[PDB]
Structure 1
């Protein structure tokens, strides 16, 4: 009666069966341990009691088809050169007599997890339909420890909370901190990817993959029975999805292992996404290391606005040439050139500039429709001169498209905006959606906006433009299909280190949650952790030591890496800055050395097309002691290794700038004991010795 699906290695077993009332039910075990207790699958549809609204029970198995897939592919950019997609599949065709319609639930079981989705075939009795609620259950076998953030339709910029599932309800109120756009939905609602640690030694990750033509999935916890259930984002009318057969829901994933490191190594999310749709991607999509006129405005030292004498702005009417400069506008030609010089002097690829265009005076919280035109520069920003100058220095300018959440306005100006970028040498753009969405009533993660974010990415691909979108729906592996989407923030980033700070263990969690599905533009690299040095009125302190900031270039994976501090501060710590300069952006191999969510993450990566390795470790409040074994290096080879570590007396709060830099030789026989301070870590560059002269005067570490 029931169907059994097993992973290639036999460790995981997914059992499927329709219960007595016709409800599709599944369960999952790992090494004979229950991971998912009997859980039902189905959806309730909006009424056009009407039986047609029922798409959750009264089903009977019409057909079952199995299959095995085992193919390897190569991402345009990633944590490794090649990814293996190996799974056993079970597709179940379910017929519903009362409605004379069928659906298919496809299961794909890998050695590290399970993925499933619903498929709605074109048929006489199922064409256009609206989803009221998706009812995908995830029954937990116990009151696990979770690493979560409040379920919210508009923001994911919350600090994580570590607690038992039974404790979420009582911590929700405090976990929900202020934000310009936020719509929490439940006292027990959380976002995905959700990370958990069980008492019987398992690590479980609940998430989704290929979120396309559908609303974002959050999870709502029944904290009495410990059952998580899909909770989609509603549109302006409360509906959760306009569908038209043939169509499918995104995949829902359960990644599990008794070794936390395997959670990080899993590629289930990417494997479940459609293959690359950009035929010539390889010729133009590429990693980017950059700096930018940014931290100035984030800390309050400088401003995005050109003037402070206007009550409001009317684009096309307000004549900025007649306004008085506020003396704080960082986005001015001379200043930009200084950044370009620094960028070129240290091997950076691009320079981001925010506040270059008209309109910033009204960018925040006004729910303004015609807020930006994305093409008209302020009087002090010479677009052409900056382009000529940047090109002369071998630098590329990164365009900035803050939309202030006015989406129709952005779409109306998009083609002209992208054409302006093309005409002026910008091949990458950082977009933003700060504020409540316009059309008013919609949320940042509903089906409507998900369509927009992808629309912006697909159009960008046509212009050979790469995109990094802040405030957009968190990633679900779509980068595989559209590799020009080199980033998103979509989580609490370094900017909040300027707004009071991020929890000390923040970066020891992000890799297990946010990063699953795509890279994050975290903008690490702050050396002067006291923001009051940028702006006297800003008393925020970055919760990190300098060594840990260096580590993030390896522990916070991304093909897009920013060195966020200002040039002046890097010039003060030029020796430590060398690691940021040296670190690669793309990798042929990645080895997860140590990993425990909320405590520590140590990773070693092999720079693409080289035999150079880079290591980074980020630790929580208890610090961490590592016993590194460099057996991943090549036998018979020697490497010039530079170790950037916390000083014995380092502390994120009391002594964040105390670090040591040691240079020596390493081989696959080398071993090192390193200690990461409280809120600290370390970084190591390991370069293969090409010429004997390189090792000249160096000894083993």
Structure 2
């Protein structure tokens, strides 16, 4: 038996090898059980039977302990500086029957535990294939969980809030239709998984540094309340090709008696390798943008240039011989009106989708040669858009939807990134909509994880920033490659056009999806009835206008869209001011209020300023805030503008009802505010 304690002494992890030589761990917090005794280990694919066993028959050959305490600065983040402070136990475990050794490394922080497996180079462990990882997390009770279905292919599901014992009965309805989805179990859920216990704890289960390895989901044993690592299989059912020396990703248990401290934890980032982009600070930069986007997402407009053809063949179809469909939003004149608005209002960039040949066939065809990423449609003048944008101090953000055709994207990748450089594009939104090609792979297997990271490492060579939709959900790698400024990789604002997101969605994402990296959520919908874009579309955004403003503060990202069309912003320009003002990068963050599923309220100090921005987002019952502004600087005065729900505001019946109040605040000020149902508020607080 071996004990490890957090620096503050509040957490204790006990490790032991049992009688069958299986490694076991457990974890307590303030003397409460968080993880019950839980085994660790892996089973390997057969090439001898005993070699398949990397889960028991071990003995402790060595232990080492260490303490780390160093502060580092992210290129962009929720605060200027992050402290990485932990006590470590490393245990060398030897398996006589196989004459081989592994190491399990534990790092225990004041806010939780990380563990991983290490496989040293040695005579009898070199090349191996993982059949299953058997990392357990035994729960001490039938907790409340906030979860989406375990799935190898999508995370674009609404959350469910339920007991662990209720997950099974709810899985069928929780799995809604998607273009690519492979659920794996009636009790399978994804990470990060957020839980609230009856004895007042908050527990988050996740992984960190998902590199050269398959994505971990969790399979719940709902009779014993034990979660277990369930990795994503390849086209043959295997779960990772390994070569020593190599490590698994970290597995993390983040725990506190204060839900706010889950949001504050930096465990995920802390467990990633330090920045490998030496010049990152010189070129990696936050981006606020608008886009030719919502037209197509609502169905008002098309990505396609033409409706005349039953299919297209790149290099054969002559688009100049085709009839424009009259709906193609990515045309030069329209694009320039977006640049105009962007530049009028202080935005950095304009995204355009549907600019390149191919879009007629983008959806659900399993098409290999679906795009070339370089050839514009006849009505999109690349160089003139570039000149016009540059004139206005605006950057165009590139769009590389791959339609999940991965070999095809790789073959064009250097040409595509060269085209970006040649044409003044320095960020790209990529996409992987559809089932993966090569066919047989899943979006989150080891094979695709390699692709996503290859795309980002190659981008870094071109000084290009990457925002990858449909990719594996983040696990802190942005620390290592700060040019990964976004993913979607969860259910975003676009689904508010596809029937809606749950009213409580944005009170969950920061506790789950956001752990490991920002999301390109694309907030800022002011006209929430999609039927005003497209009369055939009766979807309604589940939000008030004020809650949309809040999201620029409650959905942290160095990449922030204002997603509505300019004409809609023009109708509510007074509210639009908050989107214009809000910063993208922060020196400090204060988590003021937080309860998963119910409300989140955050105040952040804009980097290199003494201005603060506050947002509150609420669920189905609203939320009353008693805000206390003692985080402001003593003796200073600030001009505060409060953008709040009207008293009769409601996400469904009255979403555009907002108030704007401008006044002075100091560190002695207090405000009482009420977020409507599916409502919220935003405050800018600028030092006089």
TM class, shorter-chain normalised? over 0.9
2:89 aligns to what? 90
Q: Residue by residue, what CA displacement relative to the aligned partner does 1:80-116 show, whole Å, maximum 9, x if unpaired?
A: 0000000000000000000000000000000000000
Alpha-carbon deviation of 1:315?
Answer: 0.1
Q: Residue by residue, what CA displacement relative to the aligned partner does 1:519-540 show, whole Å, maximum 9, x if unpaired?
A: 0000000000000000000000
Alpha-carbon deviation of 1:419?
Answer: 0.2
Distance 1:442 1:175 in 2: 24
SS of structure 2 residue aligned to 1:339 = helix
Distance 2:434 2:681 in 1: 37
Alpha-carbon deviation of 1:627?
Answer: 0.3
2:275 aligns to what? 276
Alpha-carbon deviation of 1:37?
Answer: 0.2
1:134 aligns to what? 133
Distance 1:143 1:327 in 2: 56
Distance 1:481 1:226 in 2: 35
2:459 aligns to what? 460
Q: Residue by residue, what CA displacement relative to the aligned partner does 1:166-224 show, whole Å, maximum 9, x if unpaired?
A: 00000000000000000000000000000000000000000000000000000000000
Distance 1:256 1:383 in 2: 50
Distance 2:535 2:658 in 1: 26
For structure 1, the 5+ residue unaligned runs are 690-701
Q: Residue by residue, what CA displacement relative to the aligned partner does 1:313-371 show, whole Å, maximum 9, x if unpaired?
A: 00000000000000000000000000000000000000000000000000000000000
SS of structure 1 residue aligned to 2:173 = helix
SS of structure 1 residue aligned to 2:609 = coil
Distance 1:142 1:185 in 2: 24
Alpha-carbon deviation of 1:502?
Answer: 0.1
Distance 1:359 1:214 in 2: 33
What TM-score does the superposition give when structure 2 sets the normalisation length?
A: 1.00
2:166 aligns to what? 167
SS of structure 2 residue aligned to 1:88 = strand
SS of structure 1 residue aligned to 2:542 = coil
Alpha-carbon deviation of 1:624?
Answer: 0.1
SS of structure 1 residue aligned to 2:653 = coil
1:445 aligns to what? 444
Q: Residue by residue, what CA displacement relative to the aligned partner does 1:450-500 show, whole Å, maximum 9, x if unpaired?
A: 000000000000000000000000000000000000000000000000000
1:542-691 superposed matches below 5 A: 542-689=541-688
Q: Residue by residue, what CA displacement relative to the aligned partner does 1:44-93 show, whole Å, maximum 9, x if unpaired?
A: 00000600000000000000000000000000000000000000000000
Alpha-carbon deviation of 1:507?
Answer: 0.1
SS of structure 1 residue aligned to 2:686 = strand
Alpha-carbon deviation of 1:678?
Answer: 0.1
Distance 1:149 1:556 in 2: 19
Distance 1:413 1:311 in 2: 25
Q: Residue by residue, what CA displacement relative to the aligned partner does 1:225-284 show, whole Å, maximum 9, x if unpaired?
A: 000000000000000000000000000000000000000000000000000000000000
Q: Residue by residue, what CA displacement relative to the aligned partner does 1:586-627 show, whole Å, maximum 9, x if unpaired?
A: 000000000000000000000000000000000000000000
Q: Residue by residue, what CA displacement relative to the aligned partner does 1:410-432 show, whole Å, maximum 9, x if unpaired?
A: 00000000000000000000000
Alpha-carbon deviation of 1:394?
Answer: 0.2
Which runs of structure 1 show a deviation greater than 2 angstroms over 4 or more consecutive aligned residues? none
Alpha-carbon deviation of 1:28?
Answer: 0.1
Distance 2:107 2:442 in 1: 31
SS of structure 2 residue aligned to 1:264 = helix
Alpha-carbon deviation of 1:34?
Answer: 0.1
SS of structure 1 residue aligned to 2:219 = strand
1:332 aligns to what? 331
SS of structure 2 residue aligned to 1:558 = coil
SS of structure 1 residue aligned to 2:281 = helix
Distance 1:65 1:544 in 2: 52
Distance 2:410 2:48 in 1: 41
1:692 aligns to what? none
Alpha-carbon deviation of 1:644?
Answer: 0.1
1:305 aligns to what? 304
Q: Residue by residue, what CA displacement relative to the aligned partner does 1:493-522 show, whole Å, maximum 9, x if unpaired?
A: 000000000000000000000000000000
Q: Residue by residue, what CA displacement relative to the aligned partner does 1:432-463 show, whole Å, maximum 9, x if unpaired?
A: 00000000000000000000000000000000
Distance 2:29 2:126 in 1: 38
Pairwise CA RMSD: 0.3
SS of structure 2 residue aligned to 1:523 = coil
Distance 1:626 1:8 in 2: 34
Distance 1:302 1:624 in 2: 37
Distance 1:497 1:438 in 2: 28
Alpha-carbon deviation of 1:133?
Answer: 0.1
Distance 2:620 2:233 in 1: 38
For structure 2, the 5+ residue unaligned runs are none
SS of structure 1 residue aligned to 2:15 = strand
What TM-score does the superposition give when structure 1 sets the normalisation length?
A: 0.98
SS of structure 1 residue aligned to 2:343 = helix
- How many corresponding residue pairs? 688
Distance 2:172 2:453 in 1: 33
SS of structure 2 residue aligned to 1:616 = strand
Q: Residue by residue, what CA displacement relative to the aligned partner does 1:360-411 show, whole Å, maximum 9, x if unpaired?
A: 0000000000000000000000000000000000000000000000000000
Distance 2:212 2:472 in 1: 13
SS of structure 1 residue aligned to 2:575 = helix
Distance 2:179 2:291 in 1: 24
Alpha-carbon deviation of 1:155?
Answer: 0.1
Q: Residue by residue, what CA displacement relative to the aligned partner does 1:630-658 show, whole Å, maximum 9, x if unpaired?
A: 00000000000000000000000000000
SS of structure 1 residue aligned to 2:43 = strand
Alpha-carbon deviation of 1:149?
Answer: 0.2
1:41-120 superposed matches below 5 A: 41-48=40-47, 50-120=49-119
Distance 2:51 2:177 in 1: 41
SS of structure 1 residue aligned to 2:35 = strand
Distance 1:626 1:62 in 2: 55
1:321 aligns to what? 320
Distance 1:460 1:228 in 2: 37
SS of structure 1 residue aligned to 2:396 = strand
